[PDB]
Design an enzyme around this catalytic site. Sequence first.
Site, PDB file in Angstrom:
ATOM      1  N   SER A 180       0.776  -1.248   0.000  1.00  0.00           N
ATOM      2  CA  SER A 180       0.000   0.000   0.000  1.00  0.00           C
ATOM      3  C   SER A 180       0.805   1.294   0.000  1.00  0.00           C
ATOM      4  CB  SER A 180      -0.970  -0.009   1.174  1.00  0.00           C
ATOM      5  OG  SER A 180      -1.744   1.177   1.177  1.00  0.00           O
ATOM      6  N   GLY A 181       0.616   2.102  -1.040  1.00  0.00           N
ATOM      7  CA  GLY A 181       1.345   3.363  -1.145  1.00  0.00           C
ATOM      8  C   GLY A 181       2.751   3.254  -1.711  1.00  0.00           C
ATOM      9  N   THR A 185      -0.729   2.837  -8.679  1.00  0.00           N
ATOM     10  CA  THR A 185      -1.720   3.678  -9.365  1.00  0.00           C
ATOM     11  C   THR A 185      -1.077   4.790 -10.194  1.00  0.00           C
ATOM     12  OG1 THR A 185      -3.493   3.315  -7.728  1.00  0.00           O
ATOM     13  CG2 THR A 185      -3.605   5.308  -9.048  1.00  0.00           C
ATOM     14  N   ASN A 232      -1.717   5.553   2.982  1.00  0.00           N
ATOM     15  CA  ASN A 232      -1.694   6.286   1.729  1.00  0.00           C
ATOM     16  C   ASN A 232      -2.824   7.315   1.782  1.00  0.00           C
ATOM     17  OD1 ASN A 232      -1.693   7.156  -0.955  1.00  0.00           O
ATOM     18  ND2 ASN A 232      -1.231   5.090  -1.733  1.00  0.00           N
ATOM     19  N   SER A 235      -5.382   6.111  -1.229  1.00  0.00           N
ATOM     20  CA  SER A 235      -5.492   4.655  -1.273  1.00  0.00           C
ATOM     21  C   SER A 235      -6.601   4.187  -2.224  1.00  0.00           C
ATOM     22  CB  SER A 235      -5.759   4.120   0.150  1.00  0.00           C
ATOM     23  OG  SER A 235      -5.762   2.704   0.209  1.00  0.00           O
ATOM     24  N   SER A 236      -6.284   3.235  -3.098  1.00  0.00           N
ATOM     25  CA  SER A 236      -7.298   2.701  -4.011  1.00  0.00           C
ATOM     26  C   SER A 236      -8.086   1.629  -3.262  1.00  0.00           C
ATOM     27  CB  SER A 236      -6.672   2.081  -5.263  1.00  0.00           C
ATOM     28  OG  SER A 236      -5.953   3.041  -6.001  1.00  0.00           O
ATOM     29  N   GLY A 456      -3.116  -2.686  -2.942  1.00  0.00           N
ATOM     30  CA  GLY A 456      -1.992  -3.384  -2.340  1.00  0.00           C
ATOM     31  C   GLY A 456      -2.122  -4.026  -0.969  1.00  0.00           C
ATOM     32  N   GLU A 458      -1.928  -4.729   2.740  1.00  0.00           N
ATOM     33  CA  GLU A 458      -2.045  -3.800   3.868  1.00  0.00           C
ATOM     34  C   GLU A 458      -2.243  -4.527   5.184  1.00  0.00           C
ATOM     35  OE1 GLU A 458      -5.546  -1.404   2.793  1.00  0.00           O
ATOM     36  OE2 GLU A 458      -6.786  -2.961   3.703  1.00  0.00           O
TER      37      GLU A 458
HETATM   38 MG   LIG Z   1      -3.494   1.557  -6.034  1.00  0.00          MG
END
Ligand SMILES: [Mg+2]
Length: 776
Positions: A180-181, A185, A232, A235-236, A456, A458
């Site tokens: 994550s982060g 993306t 993040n 974050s997605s 991602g 996490e």
């Molecule tokens: Mg992403």
Amino acid sequence: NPIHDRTSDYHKYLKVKQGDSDLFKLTVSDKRYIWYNPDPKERDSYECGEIVSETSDSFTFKTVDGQDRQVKKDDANQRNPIKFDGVEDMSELSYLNEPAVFHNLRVRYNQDLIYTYSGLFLVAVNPFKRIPIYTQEMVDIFKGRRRNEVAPHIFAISDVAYRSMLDDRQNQSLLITGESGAGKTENTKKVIQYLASVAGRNQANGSGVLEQQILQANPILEAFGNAKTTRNNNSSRFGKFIEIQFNSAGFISGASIQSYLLEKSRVVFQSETERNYHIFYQLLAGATAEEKKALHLAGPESFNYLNQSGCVDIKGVSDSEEFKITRQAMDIVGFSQEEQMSIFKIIAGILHLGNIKFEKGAGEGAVLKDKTALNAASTVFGVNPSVLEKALMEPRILAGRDLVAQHLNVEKSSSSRDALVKALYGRLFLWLVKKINNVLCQERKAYFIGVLDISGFEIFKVNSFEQLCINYTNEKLQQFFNHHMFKLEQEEYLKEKINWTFIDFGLDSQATIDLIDGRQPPGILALLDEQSVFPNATDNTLITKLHSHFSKKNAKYEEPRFSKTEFGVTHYAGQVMYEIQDWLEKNKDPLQQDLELCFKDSSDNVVTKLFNDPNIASRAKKGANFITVAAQYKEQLASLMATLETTNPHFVRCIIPNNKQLPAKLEDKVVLDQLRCNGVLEGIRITRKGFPNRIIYADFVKRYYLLAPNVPRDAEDSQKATDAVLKHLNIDPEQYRFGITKIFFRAGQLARIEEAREQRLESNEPPMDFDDDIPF
Ligand SMILES: [Mg+2]
Ligand SMILES: Oc1c(Br)cc(Br)cc1-c1[nH]c(Br)c(Br)c1Br
């Protein structure tokens, strides 16, 4: 040419700075150094020491302080000659070990060089700061360049993919991994940009407009689908597979997005310091007073779904400024000025509903004393307030065949209101996605390049069902890399009978993937589903079953001694302790029919669709019940992996530098973990220790043919012409190996031998000219 002008931004931003005389004096030194550990306890903290003396099986060096230690040569982390520091491709390093591979990334990264190749796949260490390497100018440079000719860049692997799609006529895919982060993306976006401008029609609206739309799509999705988590700021909270389609000619014909597993529990709950989806924050502090008065909107802290985490702003971002960009993208795609409003009516409505307060009646059935929010929500939603009320606290249900009306207590009414919310949002995303894809999808594709951009790995303090699904995926993608990198590859060398001694790179998370989605015997998602269909089942009955099946039985599983509601799973990225609370109702995804019966009756043409469109409002039925969350995702995933397996994959491993979202702070214990679990070095050992170059003797006539004296693109054995074309040039045969349907070449040997005759202007067509009609 900027590539060669050591003055261009290209050289200023993509190439490693020229050294000084002091450095040269050093680069030519005769000294030898070792990468050691000042403190055994901490493996990942390394120091450079000079090798002072040695023996047949050991080295002896002096530490930074001045003391001397020795070490058997086998357990020696030799330092690469400093002429390598900065290498754009670690495949070339002489010593391939953790500290060595990490030092190169440090060097390059300290220079703001985030890209480096580790063989066939690229690497990307988050800069956490902007760098001018994605301008149209840098786009143009990379277009049509062989990977060797240019420096490592997300634009390169993209182009490389492109040519390969065009050349082999095989569909391709870009798989970007990372926790994550890490950049997934951001890098995802660059692939589209490059692919859009390089293979686009130069703007004929349809193809310069179709491209603007494709580009204007992501901001929409990022507005309603991304949010601030403790890892993040953007974050997605949902994965996606973007497909870029090309006509037979090779030009962008279209694109289509496939969303995945959106964390929809976020609309109603956010952990401390996090944020709901940006979308709420933008419209709230970015909408015109006139609009502000039509949706009865107010301050973010006024709304219960936004004032609980203790965070309404994101350092550096302007929700109002962002709100604009969003509306800007909605127009480019095709959204009506009417449609857009509903979009916000639905969002304003999701906020009001959350303000709804349920209270204990005289009896145990909950009551709503204040209708202010109830009516606000009903108002902008085009629904009937008293119908909604009854639907919220007194849902009618069937008792056998009887029609009984329930009367939910405060707790149960709240949860129902939340189910309404989440259901509302999920549909809208879907719709927004659904609506969008109709703009971008208007021609049968000939070929496509897929771009997978997931959530991602996490690890939050409280990890629930969403986090299990997320990490399950990150584990699935990881294995996709292993398989292709070591399994398929080695499997190819075995039958060719090229005499390849099998290697076990110790990378295989099948056990972990099995403990989750396995059916027989039943993994976690199986028992979960099974528990999801049993009438008197509870969270307790569930963890106990899980424990029962795997505690002290499965190696990737663990029953904690400090808890009776958490179970631990060992992932490739680390162990994760999951709280089982709410998993049942989360997996079941309940919603009162009366509510669904209340919204179909909506005046708003957008809302109505959410509850009436079958592909929006419907839900598969698994025999006597509906399909579970855990079951469709496993299904959707399996479908993707199926789609993926049918393409030629290009990997990009994104690496987070530290855990503080800070630039110029490459923490080494953090980076090394990632490189370890990601299997980077292993990914490199295999390309070095292997022959990745391979072509049948038929296509041998494609480029190596007139090499030699006599020996052309034709013959009745091309296996005869093999050892004659390179032998004449006496190319080391210990470099290649001629196993039998085709022939392999070691480590880009096909290349050296390629340029042997490739960049050959000597006879390449300047023999015609010698005894021409120059003889009379
Ligand atoms: Mg992403
Ligand atoms: O949220 C709900 C609910 Br409570 C019931 C149904 Br039936 C569908 C959705 C929905 N959620 C996501 Br996510 C998608 Br896609 C869809 Br359709």
